[PDB]
């Protein structure tokens, strides 16, 4: 909508106060004009018609319980935009400052979040498996990263290409979490998963097997569930990315860590220059090796570590 840019204040899902960029025209709307062609947050009103209504508020204060998922979806979309712009020189998900749209309060008891081809969508959770999923910066950045992938490599959401697609979203979700630097880790969704259980998460990149996901290609799932295991076999790539950044010895293979920033540069270049819709894990290895070669040189430690990491997870 047309209006003047304003700064509201509210509380997110976890009770933390933050400022939000809003737009004033009779009401104050969750429309951030400071980033690209805007970040817009919508109320789906417990239904499944999308996007719903652009979030409107009478006083620019967002402290009601119902406001909290919208505050975080809006704010963390901004963080994610900033990460891609500041770190990778990428303007929104399409590289041309496309408007970023999110809807919250999707359906009832909805234990998930997704990118629907056009926008991000967040359930509130059922209060036991999840609380409202926009409370997780890694979840928000995971979903927006699907938009990036969809515009760039276009990895088909099935089998190995789909597991790469998922791992890319977990990788950049995690790198965005570190960029914001609140309580960062290599786990996925810990801030919104199982409020009654401390210390767990939906997936682990440092130890995928903690939640039954494979950490080596020999353990890959080959059935048909979950689009051929896209959220399962992502563990193999997540583990490789974790090893590239942090190092370690995994099934006897030692990897020299090179840190998160270089992990991000290598995988962003692979995503945007080398991967294609049909890429498999072997092709991801080659794309990552080539990306590291481009950035750091063929004789670099960075290239050697990429090779070590894919060796360690059984990807040749
Ligand atoms: N996002 C993953 C895990 C969440 C499961 C919650 N229902 C999936 O859709 O499979
Ligand atoms: C819950 C979120 C991280 C995603 N839709 C799965 O995985
Ligand atoms: Ca208000
Ligand atoms: Ca965390
Ligand atoms: Ca996390
Ligand atoms: Ca928990
Ligand atoms: Zn995903």
Domain match, 244 and 106 both: no
Domain contains 243? yes
Q: Which of 88, 105, 143, 250 is catalytic?
A: 143
Please tell me the distance from the alpha carbon of residue 222 to that of residue 212, in angstroms, as a whole number. Answer: 15
**23: in domain:** yes
Within-domain flag for 11? yes
Domain shared by 119 and 40, yes or no = yes
CA-to-CA distance for 270 and 291, rounded, in angstroms? 6
Please tell me the number of the ligand nearest to residue 155's CA.
Answer: 7
State the pairing for strand pair 113-115/17-25: unpaired
Residues with CB under 6 A from ligand 1: 111-112, 202, 231
Q: Looking at the CA of residue 142, tell me the nearest atom of ligand 2.
A: 3
Q: Which two tokens stand for residue 308?
A: 């070590």
CA–CA gap between residue 221 and residue 124 (Å, rounded) = 30
- Is 1 part of a structural domain of the chain? no
Q: Quick one: 131 and 228 in the same domain?
A: no
Q: Are residues 131 and 183 in the same domain?
A: no
Contact 144, 115 (CB under 8 A): yes
Task: List the beta bridge partners of residue 130.
Answer: 193
CATH of the domain at 33: 3.10.170.10
Residue found under tokens 């990897």: 255
* Nearest alpha-carbon partner for 176 in 163, 164, 188: 188
98 falls within a domain: yes
Residue ending a domain, choose from 135, 154, 173:
154
- Please say if 88 is a catalytic residue: no
- Element of type H or E holding 144: helix 137-151
Which helix (H) or strand (E) is 266 found in, with range?
Answer: helix 260-269
CATH code: domain of residue 189: 1.10.390.10
**Count of structural domains within the chain:** 2
Q: How many CA atoms within 13 Å lie on the side-chain side of 221?
A: 22
**Residues 6 or more apart from 89 whose CB is under 8 A from it?**
none
Instruction: Tell which residues of the chain come right before a gap with C–N over 2.5 A.
Output: none
Q: What is the number of residues in the chain?
A: 316
Q: Which residues line the annotated binding site for Ca(2+)?
A: 57, 59, 61, 138, 177, 183, 185, 187, 190, 194, 197, 200
Residue that has been written with the tokens 């997704």 in this structure:
114
Nearest CA owner, ligand 1 atom 7: 111
CB 231 less than 6 A from any atom of ligand 2: yes
Which of 117, 132, 154 delimits the end of a domain? 154
- Domain span holding position 47: 6-154
The atom of ligand 2 lying closest to the CA of 173 is 3
Same domain as 144, residue 159 = no
Q: Which residue has the tokens 């429309």?
A: 31
Supply 44's token pair. Answer: 């789906």
In the chain the first and final C-alpha atoms are separated, in Å, by 51
Ligand 2 pocket, residue 132 CB under 6 Å: no
User: Is there a single domain that holds both residue 113 and residue 237?
Assistant: no
Task: Return the ligand 1 atom nearest residue 113 CA.
Answer: 1
Give dist(CA 242, CA 244) in Å, integer. Answer: 5
Residue whose token pair is 């901004």 = 78
Cis peptide leading into residue 255 (ω within 30°): no
Count CA within 13 A, CB hemisphere, residue 169.
Answer: 31
Decide if 185 is inside a domain. yes
Q: How far is CA 4 from the centre of its chain?
A: 30
Distance CA 36, CA 91 (A): 7
Contact 46, 107 (CB under 8 A): yes
- 281 within domain boundaries: yes
Same domain, 178 and 303: yes
Structural determination approach: X-ray
- Which pairing describes strands 39-43 and 100-106: parallel, antiparallel, or unpaired? parallel
Which residue in 300, 306, 209 sits closest to 251, CA to CA? 209
């Amino acid at each position: 909508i047309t209006g003047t840019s304003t700064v509201g204040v509210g509380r997110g899902v976890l009770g933390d106060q933050k400022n939000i960029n809003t737009t004033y025209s009779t009401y104050y709307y969750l429309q951030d004009n400071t980033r690209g062609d805007g970040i817009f947050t919508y109320d789906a009103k417990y239904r499944t018609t999308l996007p719903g209504s652009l979030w409107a508020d009478a006083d620019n204060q967002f402290f009601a319980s119902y406001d909290a998922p919208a505050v975080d979806a809006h704010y963390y979309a901004g963080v994610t935009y900033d990460y891609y712009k500041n770190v990778h020189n990428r303007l929104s998900y399409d590289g041309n400052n496309a408007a970023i749209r999110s809807s919250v309060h999707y359906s009832q008891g909805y234990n998930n979040a997704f990118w629907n081809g056009s926008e991000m969508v967040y359930g509130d959770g059922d209060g036991q498996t999840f609380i409202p999923l926009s409370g997780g910066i890694d979840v928000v950045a995971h979903e927006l990263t699907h938009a990036v992938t969809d515009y760039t490599a276009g990895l088909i959401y099935q089998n190995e290409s789909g597991a790469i697609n998922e791992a890319i979203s977990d990788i950049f979700g995690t790198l965005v979490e570190f960029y914001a630097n609140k309580n960062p880790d290599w786990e996925i969704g810990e801030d919104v998963y199982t409020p009654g259980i401390s210390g767990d998460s939906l997936r682990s990149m440092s130890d995928p097997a903690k939640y039954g996901d494979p950490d080596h290609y020999s353990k890959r799932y080959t059935g048909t569930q979950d689009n051929g295991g896209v959220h399962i076999n992502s563990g193999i790539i997540n583990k490789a990315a974790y090893l590239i950044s942090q190092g370690g010895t995994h099934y006897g293979v030692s990897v020299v860590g090179i840190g998160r920033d270089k992990l991000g540069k290598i995988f962003y270049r692979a995503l945007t220059q080398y991967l294609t819709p049909t890429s498999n894990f072997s092709q991801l290895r080659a794309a990552a090796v080539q990306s590291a070669t481009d950035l750091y040189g063929s004789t670099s430690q960075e290239v050697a570590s990429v090779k070590q990491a894919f060796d360690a997870v059984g990807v040749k």
